Coordinates of C-alpha atoms and ligand atoms in Angstrom, one line a residue:
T2 CA -17.3 14.1 15.8
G3 CA -15.2 17.2 16.2
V4 CA -11.5 17.7 16.6
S5 CA -10.2 15.5 19.5
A6 CA -7.8 12.7 19.8
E7 CA -10.8 10.5 20.7
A8 CA -12.5 11.4 17.4
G9 CA -9.2 10.9 15.6
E10 CA -8.8 7.4 17.1
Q11 CA -12.1 6.4 15.5
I12 CA -11.1 7.8 12.2
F13 CA -7.6 6.2 12.2
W14 CA -9.2 2.8 12.8
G15 CA -12.2 3.6 10.6
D16 CA -13.0 5.9 7.6
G17 CA -9.5 7.3 7.5
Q18 CA -8.3 3.8 6.4
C19 CA -5.0 4.4 8.3
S20 CA -5.2 1.0 10.0
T21 CA -5.4 -0.8 6.7
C22 CA -1.7 0.0 6.4
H23 CA -0.5 1.1 9.8
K24 CA -0.6 -0.8 13.1
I25 CA 0.2 0.7 16.6
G26 CA 2.3 -1.8 18.6
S27 CA 0.1 -4.9 19.1
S28 CA -3.0 -2.9 18.1
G29 CA -3.9 -4.0 14.5
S30 CA -1.8 -6.2 12.2
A31 CA -1.2 -4.1 9.1
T32 CA 2.4 -3.8 8.0
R33 CA 2.0 -1.8 4.7
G34 CA 3.3 1.3 6.4
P35 CA 5.3 1.9 9.6
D36 CA 4.2 1.0 13.1
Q37 CA 2.9 4.2 14.6
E38 CA 3.7 3.4 18.2
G39 CA 5.8 6.3 19.5
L40 CA 5.0 8.3 16.4
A41 CA 4.7 11.6 18.3
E42 CA 8.3 11.4 19.5
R43 CA 9.9 10.3 16.3
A44 CA 7.9 13.0 14.5
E45 CA 9.9 15.5 16.6
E46 CA 13.1 13.9 15.3
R47 CA 11.9 13.8 11.7
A48 CA 11.1 17.5 12.0
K49 CA 14.6 18.3 13.2
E50 CA 16.2 16.2 10.4
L51 CA 14.0 17.8 7.8
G52 CA 14.2 21.4 9.0
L53 CA 10.5 21.6 9.8
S54 CA 9.2 23.7 12.7
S55 CA 7.7 21.0 14.9
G56 CA 6.8 17.3 15.0
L57 CA 3.2 18.3 14.4
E58 CA 4.2 20.0 11.1
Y59 CA 5.9 16.8 10.0
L60 CA 2.7 14.9 10.8
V61 CA 0.7 17.4 8.8
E62 CA 3.1 17.1 5.9
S63 CA 2.9 13.3 6.1
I64 CA -0.8 13.5 5.4
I65 CA -1.1 16.4 3.0
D66 CA 2.1 15.5 0.9
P67 CA 2.8 11.8 1.6
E68 CA 5.4 11.6 -1.2
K69 CA 7.5 14.5 0.1
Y70 CA 9.3 12.3 2.6
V71 CA 9.4 8.6 2.3
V72 CA 10.3 6.7 5.5
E73 CA 13.3 4.4 5.0
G74 CA 12.3 0.9 4.1
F75 CA 9.0 1.9 2.5
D76 CA 7.9 3.1 -1.0
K77 CA 5.5 5.8 -2.1
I78 CA 2.2 4.0 -1.5
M79 CA 0.4 6.2 1.1
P80 CA -2.5 7.9 -0.7
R81 CA -3.6 11.5 -0.2
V82 CA -6.7 10.8 2.0
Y83 CA -8.4 14.1 1.2
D84 CA -8.6 12.9 -2.4
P85 CA -10.7 10.1 -3.8
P86 CA -11.5 7.5 -3.0
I87 CA -11.1 8.1 0.7
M88 CA -12.2 11.8 0.6
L89 CA -11.5 12.3 4.3
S90 CA -13.0 15.7 5.5
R91 CA -10.8 18.4 6.8
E92 CA -12.3 18.2 10.3
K93 CA -11.6 14.5 10.3
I94 CA -7.9 15.1 9.3
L95 CA -7.5 17.6 12.1
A96 CA -9.0 15.0 14.5
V97 CA -6.5 12.3 13.2
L98 CA -3.7 14.7 13.8
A99 CA -4.8 15.0 17.5
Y100 CA -4.8 11.2 17.7
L101 CA -1.3 10.9 16.1
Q102 CA 0.0 13.4 18.7
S103 CA -1.4 11.2 21.5
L104 CA 0.9 8.4 20.3
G105 CA 3.6 9.2 22.8
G106 CA 2.8 12.9 23.1
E107 CA 0.1 15.3 24.1
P108 CA -2.7 16.5 21.7
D109 CA -2.5 20.3 21.3
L110 CA -5.9 21.4 19.9
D111 CA -4.8 25.1 19.5
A112 CA -1.7 24.1 17.5
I113 CA -3.6 21.6 15.4
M114 CA -6.3 24.1 14.5
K115 CA -3.7 26.6 13.1
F116 CA -2.9 24.1 10.4
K117 CA -6.5 24.0 9.2
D118 CA -5.7 26.3 6.3
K119 CA -3.0 23.8 5.0
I120 CA -5.4 20.9 4.9
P121 CA -7.1 20.5 1.5
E122 CA -10.9 20.1 1.6
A123 CA -12.0 16.8 0.2
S124 CA -15.1 18.4 -1.5
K125 CA -12.7 20.7 -3.3
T126 CA -10.4 18.0 -4.7
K127 CA -8.7 18.9 -7.9
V128 CA -8.6 15.2 -9.0
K129 CA -10.5 14.8 -12.3
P130 CA -13.1 12.1 -12.5
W131 CA -11.7 8.8 -13.8
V132 CA -13.2 8.1 -17.3
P133 CA -11.8 5.2 -19.3
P134 CA -11.6 5.8 -23.0
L135 CA -13.9 2.8 -23.6
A136 CA -17.1 1.6 -22.0
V137 CA -16.0 -1.0 -19.5
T138 CA -17.6 -2.3 -16.3
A139 CA -16.4 -3.7 -13.0
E140 CA -18.2 -7.0 -13.8
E141 CA -16.2 -7.2 -17.1
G142 CA -13.0 -6.5 -15.2
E143 CA -13.9 -9.2 -12.6
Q144 CA -14.0 -11.7 -15.5
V145 CA -10.6 -10.5 -16.8
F146 CA -9.1 -10.7 -13.3
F147 CA -9.9 -14.4 -12.9
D148 CA -9.6 -15.5 -16.6
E149 CA -7.1 -18.5 -16.6
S150 CA -7.1 -18.5 -20.4
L151 CA -5.2 -15.1 -20.6
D152 CA -1.4 -14.9 -20.5
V153 CA -1.8 -13.2 -17.1
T154 CA -4.4 -14.1 -14.5
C155 CA -4.5 -11.7 -11.5
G156 CA -6.4 -14.4 -9.5
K157 CA -3.4 -16.7 -9.7
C158 CA -1.7 -14.3 -7.2
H159 CA -4.4 -12.1 -5.6
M160 CA -7.4 -13.0 -3.5
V161 CA -10.7 -11.0 -3.5
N162 CA -13.5 -11.9 -1.1
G163 CA -12.2 -15.5 -0.8
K164 CA -11.7 -16.1 -4.5
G165 CA -8.2 -16.4 -6.0
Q166 CA -4.8 -17.6 -4.8
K167 CA -2.7 -16.0 -2.1
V168 CA 0.7 -14.9 -3.5
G169 CA 0.6 -11.1 -3.6
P170 CA -1.5 -9.1 -1.2
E171 CA -5.2 -9.7 -0.9
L172 CA -7.0 -7.0 -2.9
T173 CA -10.3 -7.0 -1.1
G174 CA -11.2 -3.5 -0.2
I175 CA -8.4 -1.8 -2.1
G176 CA -10.8 0.3 -4.2
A177 CA -11.8 2.1 -1.0
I178 CA -8.1 3.1 -0.4
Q179 CA -6.1 3.5 -3.6
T180 CA -6.4 5.6 -6.7
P181 CA -6.9 4.5 -10.3
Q182 CA -3.5 6.0 -11.0
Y183 CA -2.0 3.7 -8.4
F184 CA -3.7 0.8 -10.1
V185 CA -2.3 1.8 -13.5
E186 CA 1.2 2.0 -12.1
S187 CA 0.8 -1.2 -10.1
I188 CA -0.2 -3.1 -13.2
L189 CA 2.2 -1.6 -15.8
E190 CA 5.1 -0.7 -13.5
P191 CA 4.9 -3.4 -10.8
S192 CA 8.4 -2.9 -9.3
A193 CA 8.0 0.9 -9.2
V194 CA 6.4 0.5 -5.7
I195 CA 6.7 -2.7 -3.7
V196 CA 4.1 -3.5 -1.1
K197 CA 6.0 -3.9 2.2
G198 CA 6.8 -7.6 2.9
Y199 CA 6.3 -8.6 -0.7
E200 CA 9.9 -8.1 -1.8
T201 CA 11.7 -10.7 -3.9
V202 CA 14.5 -12.5 -2.1
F203 CA 17.6 -14.0 -3.7
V204 CA 18.5 -17.3 -2.0
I205 CA 21.7 -19.4 -2.4
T206 CA 21.8 -22.8 -0.9
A207 CA 24.8 -24.6 0.5
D208 CA 24.9 -26.7 -2.6
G209 CA 25.0 -23.5 -4.7
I210 CA 21.4 -23.6 -6.0
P211 CA 19.8 -20.2 -6.6
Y212 CA 16.2 -19.5 -5.8
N213 CA 14.6 -16.1 -6.5
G214 CA 11.1 -15.4 -5.3
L215 CA 8.7 -14.1 -2.7
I216 CA 8.7 -15.5 0.8
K217 CA 5.4 -17.2 1.5
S218 CA 6.2 -18.5 4.9
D219 CA 9.3 -18.4 7.2
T220 CA 9.5 -20.9 10.0
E221 CA 12.4 -22.1 12.2
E222 CA 13.0 -25.1 10.0
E223 CA 11.8 -24.1 6.5
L224 CA 11.6 -21.2 4.1
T225 CA 8.8 -21.5 1.5
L226 CA 9.4 -19.3 -1.6
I227 CA 7.0 -18.6 -4.4
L228 CA 8.9 -18.5 -7.7
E229 CA 7.4 -16.8 -10.8
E230 CA 8.0 -17.4 -14.5
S231 CA 5.9 -16.0 -17.4
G232 CA 2.9 -15.4 -15.1
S233 CA 3.0 -18.9 -13.6
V234 CA 4.0 -19.6 -10.0
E235 CA 5.4 -22.5 -8.0
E236 CA 6.5 -23.2 -4.4
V237 CA 9.8 -24.4 -3.2
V238 CA 10.5 -25.4 0.4
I239 CA 14.1 -24.7 1.3
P240 CA 15.4 -26.1 4.6
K241 CA 16.8 -23.3 6.8
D242 CA 19.9 -25.3 7.5
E243 CA 20.8 -25.3 3.8
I244 CA 20.5 -21.5 3.3
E245 CA 23.9 -19.9 2.7
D246 CA 22.8 -16.5 1.8
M247 CA 19.6 -14.4 1.4
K248 CA 19.3 -10.9 -0.1
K249 CA 16.2 -8.8 -0.3
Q250 CA 15.7 -7.1 -3.7
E251 CA 13.5 -4.2 -4.5
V252 CA 11.7 -6.0 -7.3
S253 CA 8.3 -7.6 -7.5
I254 CA 7.4 -11.1 -8.8
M255 CA 4.2 -9.6 -10.4
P256 CA 4.8 -9.9 -14.1
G257 CA 6.6 -6.9 -15.6
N258 CA 5.0 -7.1 -19.1
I259 CA 1.3 -6.9 -18.4
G260 CA 1.0 -4.0 -20.8
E261 CA 1.8 -6.6 -23.5
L262 CA -0.6 -9.2 -22.2
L263 CA -3.9 -7.3 -21.7
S264 CA -5.8 -5.5 -24.4
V265 CA -6.7 -1.9 -23.9
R266 CA -10.3 -3.0 -23.0
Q267 CA -9.2 -5.7 -20.6
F268 CA -6.8 -3.3 -18.9
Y269 CA -9.4 -0.6 -18.3
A270 CA -12.0 -3.2 -17.3
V271 CA -9.7 -4.6 -14.6
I272 CA -9.0 -1.1 -13.3
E273 CA -12.8 -0.6 -13.0
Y274 CA -13.0 -3.9 -11.1
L275 CA -10.2 -2.8 -8.7
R276 CA -12.0 0.6 -8.1
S277 CA -15.1 -1.3 -7.2
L278 CA -13.5 -3.4 -4.4
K279 CA -14.9 -1.4 -1.5
Ligands
HEC2 C1 -4.8 7.7 7.7 C2 -5.4 9.1 7.4 C3 -3.2 7.7 7.7 C4 -2.5 8.5 8.5 C5 -2.8 9.5 9.6 C6 -1.1 8.1 8.1 N1 -1.1 7.2 7.1 FE1 0.5 6.4 6.3 N2 2.2 5.7 5.5 C7 2.2 4.6 4.6 C8 3.6 4.3 4.2 C9 4.1 3.2 3.2 C10 4.4 5.2 4.9 C11 6.0 5.3 4.8 C12 6.4 6.0 3.5 C13 6.1 7.5 3.7 O1 6.7 8.2 4.5 O2 5.2 8.0 2.9 C14 3.5 6.1 5.7 C15 4.0 7.1 6.5 C16 3.1 7.7 7.3 C17 3.5 8.7 8.3 C18 5.0 9.1 8.7 C19 5.5 7.9 9.6 C20 6.9 8.1 10.1 O3 7.4 7.1 10.7 O4 7.6 9.1 9.8 C21 2.4 9.2 9.0 C22 2.4 10.2 10.1 C23 1.3 8.5 8.4 N3 1.7 7.7 7.4 C24 0.0 8.7 8.7 C25 1.1 3.9 4.1 C26 -0.2 4.2 4.4 C27 -1.3 3.6 3.7 C28 -1.2 2.5 2.6 C29 -2.0 2.5 1.3 C30 -2.5 4.2 4.2 C31 -3.9 3.9 3.8 C32 -2.0 5.2 5.2 N4 -0.7 5.2 5.2 C33 -2.8 6.0 5.9 C34 -2.4 6.9 6.8
HEC3 C1 -3.7 -9.0 -13.0 C2 -3.6 -8.1 -14.3 C3 -3.1 -8.3 -11.8 C4 -3.5 -7.1 -11.2 C5 -4.7 -6.2 -11.6 C6 -2.7 -6.9 -10.0 N1 -1.8 -7.9 -9.9 FE1 -0.3 -8.0 -8.6 N2 1.1 -8.2 -7.1 C7 1.9 -9.4 -6.9 C8 2.8 -9.1 -5.8 C9 3.8 -10.1 -5.3 C10 2.5 -7.7 -5.3 C11 3.2 -7.0 -4.2 C12 4.5 -6.5 -4.7 C13 4.3 -5.2 -5.5 O1 3.9 -4.1 -5.0 O2 4.5 -5.3 -6.8 C14 1.4 -7.2 -6.2 C15 0.9 -6.0 -6.1 C16 -0.3 -5.6 -6.7 C17 -1.0 -4.4 -6.5 C18 -0.8 -3.4 -5.3 C19 -1.5 -4.0 -4.1 C20 -1.5 -3.1 -2.9 O3 -2.0 -3.6 -1.8 O4 -1.0 -1.9 -2.9 C21 -2.0 -4.3 -7.4 C22 -3.2 -3.3 -7.5 C23 -1.9 -5.5 -8.2 N3 -0.8 -6.2 -7.8 C24 -2.8 -5.8 -9.2 C25 1.8 -10.5 -7.6 C26 1.1 -10.7 -8.8 C27 1.2 -11.9 -9.6 C28 2.2 -13.0 -9.3 C29 3.0 -13.7 -10.4 C30 0.3 -11.8 -10.6 C31 0.0 -12.7 -11.8 C32 -0.4 -10.5 -10.4 N4 0.1 -9.9 -9.3 C33 -1.4 -10.0 -11.2 C34 -2.0 -8.8 -11.0
CA4 CA1 5.6 10.3 3.7
CA5 CA1 4.0 -2.9 -7.1
CA6 CA1 10.5 -24.7 -11.8

């Protein structure tokens, strides 16, 4: 579809997967990454703060090296879209850059094209194929994911295609977005990266009762928390009028010892299942 902001718009809201994490004002609803309304202008300020030549160069760096600068309030979750699974082509990345420039600025085709030699080509990815050290299948991993007899059951907290229970983020489609390495880290180091909005809050009530958990819903009268203990969850409804203090914490309620609770085979099977969620 060429290199234009119009082509980039289709890619941002399509095969680039950008809109699975980013919204643009009232367009879209994803909150995993920052709202990109006004991105063109704040890229200019990012560039000045980071010593880059231009806002456009900051946009390029944000795609090719997402870890290099981490926007305040977020964790290192953005994938390299030129790598698997997304495998976004170089022309499509150039198009996306034109679209990003149109978010409060002017697309500059000549300037974008000069960064072509900095964009890795998806077909030339250096990522090695993912080969588990045992024969496992996605179907085997699906069974593990929903197995209530294990000491951890992913389906107690994660929904996939309408099955499971909504505590953490729905995992439908995540295999089209994230890497196996991200799945490994998410399972074995769950608080290393916290999906935005799924932070644990520490609550103290006026009667001095502590409640530590994930906010399920936040209304004018009531705060509903999900508390976790040893892989089990429970809800508490706390009247807003009784809340003395609330502090967000950079920790996840996803159990921190899953490496002790899954076998090698169950672990690699569940990763194959996640990879398969396209
Ligand atoms: C689809 C190809 C895209 C594009 C064009 C962008 N993203 Fe993301 N992104 C995500 C998170 C958590 C952050 C903040 C942490 C960090 O800086 O890495 C970002 C950041 C950006 C930026 C910089 C924004 C700024 O305000 O400075 C830009 C330009 C950007 N992204 C573009 C999260 C995600 C995803 C979650 C898994 C996905 C998918 C994408 N981003 C995809 C894209
Ligand atoms: C069973 C072994 C699993 C597997 C395979 C996953 N989970 Fe969880 N998870 C929970 C919460 C609150 C979050 C968000 C906060 C955080 O980032 O830790 C997550 C996150 C994930 C991810 C990342 C998802 C993404 O969109 O990037 C993945 C891949 C993941 N989990 C896999 C909560 C829970 C639980 C509540 C007690 C339980 C049990 C699990 N998760 C179990 C699993
Ligand atoms: Ca970044
Ligand atoms: Ca995590
Ligand atoms: Ca209890």
